[PDB]
Design a protein around this nucleic acid. Sequence first.
DNA 1: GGCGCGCGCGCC
DNA 2: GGCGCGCGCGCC
Length: 190
Amino acid sequence: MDPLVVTVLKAINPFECEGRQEIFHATVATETDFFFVKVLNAQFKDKFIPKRTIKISNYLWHSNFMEVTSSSVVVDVESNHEVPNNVVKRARETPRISKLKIQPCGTIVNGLFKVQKITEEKDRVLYGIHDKTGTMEVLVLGNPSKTKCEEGDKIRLTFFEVSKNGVKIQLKSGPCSFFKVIKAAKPKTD
DNA sequence: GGCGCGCGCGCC
DNA sequence: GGCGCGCGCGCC
């Protein structure tokens, strides 16, 4: 609701997303917790640099994240706020699968995930991902992709959502998700 | 009392 | 940030 002073923890450079808005994603934190912010505005990037303190007014707050529009006001401010170490650590860490299983649809998920299997289709790709807590599926709609991922590689997800599909709970790409394939290193020939 | 879960922290 | 480990609380 009212203006909120937050400390910026992470922010990617803007990329073109879908109408056809240029946007970016950031992670910010108060003294108690962190949340991810989708900033529609793009102009706002110069204010979203890690460790800077910003005051944000006129924003939307949904079930999981915070939306910052061109109607919003982002003002750089000097603050004595300090983010506790573990709030930063949790803000930045990749959630476990067993933890993800019990989150509402629309919950924003970012992180780095080991993939065991890739079910390919010209309209979607399903990535079997795994950790020690379970297995899960990551649904990326509409690509070959150009990011060809083999087993043993990793996928870096930005702004995916927990999703229900009938029986199973997966991770779903949205229109403004970012997806990247992180390839396992090739042993070389001296 | 046992144990799982969330959380914190230290080592890599 | 990943990973492993201990602590405390709440449910059984």
